[PDB]
Design a protein around this ligand. Structure first.
Ligand SMILES: CCCCCCCCCCCCCCCC(=O)OC[C@H](O)[C@@H](O)/C(O)=C(/O)C(=O)O
Ligand SMILES: OC[C@@H](O)[C@H](O)[C@@H](O)CO
Ligand SMILES: OC[C@@H](O)[C@H](O)[C@@H](O)CO
Length: 721
């Protein structure tokens, strides 16, 4: 029956498929249509069509594996999209129409109905499958009766009757928030429209509104931009993605219902975009330290995942007006145009999304200016993101503490992410493909960049842990300078180290002290493990003399500097050791398969060449100290290390500090409340992290106590001499 409910479903169809916007003369759209044509043809040629079958598709035949239910229904959704596309060869095709109708009936009778119980992953029974069923019925509503539609959605109400909780039919339900809560909307708001149920629609929208609240504990968005999910995991880049991607799809529909959301919370969405998402996007890539276990998925590398966020932003811009709309469009435009590695259209899967992106890119009225420098201290999720616009590099610092889990290994995904938050760092430079093209299955998991660890074997079956200490955090002074520290203890309490970082605009100092090891295993810090490009080879210099690296590890005692020289200055990486250090280096081909780190991925072998730099710590009380200087040529690097000759102020068990004389900036980490006199100019008095700038006879101060998560009055922590 035609009514206001169907009017909303028509709008939903324009969003999830957009056939009304299709244009055969539009190159990008025709490409997506061709993809869907191929998928439907494959499904139609392989579908079991015998009497009393045991499965619709052999590839997804074991219905004990819940993933097979969702995969099956998604194949039907693809058919629905094409049968309703005037330009498809399957438009109104009699076999396709009957196949969808008959398939819904078969699954309903033998696989997914109200009499069944969750077997496998609850997600498929409550979100994945219901969304596929909803979209299929919505697109093909003119081929189903209202009675059939209610019949096929009854099961959804059985598994998801309450819009505030998930896993309601199990012995351990949970309160829905964040991304999952948004999916609750794509499940119950649409089912509500299909079932013409006003109560389901209103109550679900009511529950959804919880997503707009700022939290100070638990899952959700924090005032500093952090986003936590799964109790205590940094997750802006995966569950945050779902939240904005799904919410942006629902909003146009919700705002037209009799229960619209107060247009005051959109300001809150704009804040998420600027404070939480934007900082994590560098040259079109979404920082992996915010993506949790999704880093182990081959089809979801950094640039691909980024599109989920970008399309959410451009949809939100479309529902905005004036300046806000134009500025959001500009944000998307500049990020996309800065990405010379990935084609954004490869992950725009609906015609409306393709259309919106094309108009934005071709509209001269929408500004596309390189993004300016920034530095975000996401203390509530223990991550820090830095970007320098003048030199063009991004830096990511991945930590954890007593407040956050180090890594997520669940559903057989991310089996070797053990050290991805043990003070691991990321460098985003001219090689936009660095963390892509198979980086995750080929990187040596025992030597994540920046981490100090022993060489003990680790089990894939292990799961994440929190850190014993709360002394982990970042003190930010401005858009270019900040200081961080991590009171580190390894996974089995056999090694410790006071690790600190000094972000000084165009370089980052890495200091480590109090390194102790009580095990029989060898300890070392991985200075770097950089994935190489066969097209852009590096010329390696040690103490400014060319060195020839081999697969076999070579030792370089008394090293003052290491420089990786590319033909592109924006890919250069230099390391300056404040005090001559004993390191080792190697360049080797590393092989692996995505299945090695994620059970559901391909076992196909992947390979990449990596350059590894490390420093062994054979004695208790050992330390390390070096400056990472990216994006400058060889001569300039050599000049800079001369300028930085005496930049190291101290690096011991209670005090770590680096001074940038050119800027007049100090980075300081104090592990106790003793009076520390710095450069014979001032004194710092409390345990904590500092970033200070001297301007004339004035001092700008940024202090942070990571344990109490508080700053402090100036006179309590600083005193000029
Ligand atoms: C540890 C404690 C965390 C507490 C968080 C409170 C909710 C419990 C989550 C139960 C597991 C769900 C999950 O990982 O979800 C896996 C999905 O079912 C997966 O199949 C998929 O592909 C997704 O996109 C997804 O939903 O994440
Ligand atoms: O004070 C908020 C903490 O920083 C968070 O990381 C929580 O522990 C999340 O569970
Ligand atoms: O990660 C530390 C947490 O306290 C867990 O031990 C709980 O079980 C909740 O996830």
């Amino acid at each position: 029956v035609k009514d206001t409910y169907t009017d909303r479903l028509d709008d939903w169809n324009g969003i999830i498929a957009g056939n009304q916007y299709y244009d055969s003369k539009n190159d990008q759209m025709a490409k997506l249509n061709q993809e869907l044509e191929g998928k439907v043809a494959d499904s139609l040629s392989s579908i079991s069509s015998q009497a009393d079958r045991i499965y619709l598709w052999e590839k997804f035949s074991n219905y004990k594996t819940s993933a097979n239910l969702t995969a099956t229904y998604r194949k039907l959704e693809e058919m629905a999209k094409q049968v309703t596309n005037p330009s498809s060869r399957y438009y109104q095709d009699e076999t396709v129409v009957r196949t969808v109708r008959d398939s819904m009936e078969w699954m309903h009778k033998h696989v997914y109905n109200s009499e069944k119980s969750i077997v496998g992953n609850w997600w498929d029974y409550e979100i994945g499958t219901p969304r596929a069923i909803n979209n299929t019925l919505s697109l093909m509503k003119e081929y189903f009766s209202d009675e059939e539609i209610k019949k096929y959605t009854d099961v959804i109400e059985k598994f998801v009757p309450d819009p505030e909780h998930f896993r309601k039919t199990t012995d351990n339900p949970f309160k829905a928030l964040g991304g999952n809560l948004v999916d609750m909307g794509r499940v119950k708001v649409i089912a509500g429209l299909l079932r013409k149920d006003d109560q389901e629609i209103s109550s679900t929208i009511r529950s959804i509104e919880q997503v707009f609240k700022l939290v100070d504990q638990g899952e959700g968005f924090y005032q500093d931009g952090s986003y936590i999910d799964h109790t205590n995991v940094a997750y802006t880049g995966a569950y945050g993605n779902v939240l904005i991607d799904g919410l942006s799809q629902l909003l146009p529909v919700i705002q037209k219902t009799k229960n619209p959301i107060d247009k005051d919370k959109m300001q809150t969405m704009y804040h998420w975009i600027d404070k939480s998402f934007a900082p994590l996007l560098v040259n079109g890539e979404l920082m992996d330290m915010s993506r949790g276990r999704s880093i182990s998925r081959a089809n979801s590398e950094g640039h691909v995942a980024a599109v989920e966020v970008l399309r959410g932003i451009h949809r939100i811009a479309d529902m905005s007006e004036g300046e806000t709309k134009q500025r959001l469009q500009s944000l998307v435009k500049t990020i996309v145009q800065s990405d010379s590695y990935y084609d954004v259209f490869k992950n725009l899967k609906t015609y409306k999304d393709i259309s919106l992106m094309q108009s934005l890119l071709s509209d001269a009225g929408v500004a596309s200016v390189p993004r300016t420098s920034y530095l975000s201290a996401f203390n509530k999720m223990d991550k820090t993101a830095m970007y320098n616009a003048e030199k063009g590099f991004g830096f990511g610092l991945s930590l954890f503490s007593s407040r956050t889990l180090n890594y997520e290994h669940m559903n057989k995904e991310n089996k070797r992410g053990w050290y991805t938050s043990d003070g691991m760092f990321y460098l985003y430079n001219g090689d936009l493909s660095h963390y892509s093209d198979g980086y995750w299955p080929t990187v040596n998991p025992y030597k994540m960049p920046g981490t100090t660890e022993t060489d003990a074997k680790r089990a894939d079956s292990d799961t994440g842990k929190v850190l014993p200490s709360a002394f982990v955090g970042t003190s930010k002074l401005d858009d270019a300078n900040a200081t961080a520290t991590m009171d580190f203890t390894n996974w089995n309490q056999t090694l410790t180290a006071h690790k600190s970082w000094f972000m000084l605009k165009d370089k980052i100092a890495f200091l480590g002290s109090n390194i102790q090891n009580t095990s029989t295993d060898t300890a070392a810090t991985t200075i770097d493990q950089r994935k190489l490009e066969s097209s852009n080879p590096y010329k390696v210099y040690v103490n400014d003399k060319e060195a020839s690296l081999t697969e076999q590890e070579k030792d370089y005692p008394e090293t003052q500097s290491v420089f990786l020289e590319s033909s592109d200055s924006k890919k250069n990486i230099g390391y300056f050791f404040f005090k001559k250090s004993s390191i080792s280096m190697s360049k080797a081909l590393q092989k692996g398969a995505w299945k090695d780190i994620n059970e559901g991925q391909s076992d196909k072998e992947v390979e990449n060449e990596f350059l590894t730099i490390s420093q062994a710590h054979k004695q208790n009380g050992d330390s390390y100290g070096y400056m990472l200087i990216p994006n400058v040529d060889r001569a300039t690097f050599n000049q800079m290390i001369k300028e930085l000759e005496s930049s190291l102020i101290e690096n011991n068990e209670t005090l770590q500090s680096v001074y940038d004389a050119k800027q007049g900036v100090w980075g300081i980490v104090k592990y106790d409340d003793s009076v520390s006199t710095i450069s014979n100019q001032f004194q710092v008095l409390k345990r904590g992290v500092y970033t200070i700038r001297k301007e004339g006879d004035e001092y700008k101060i940024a202090y942070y106590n990571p344990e109490t998560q508080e700053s402090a009055p100036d006179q309590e922590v600083f005193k000029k001499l």
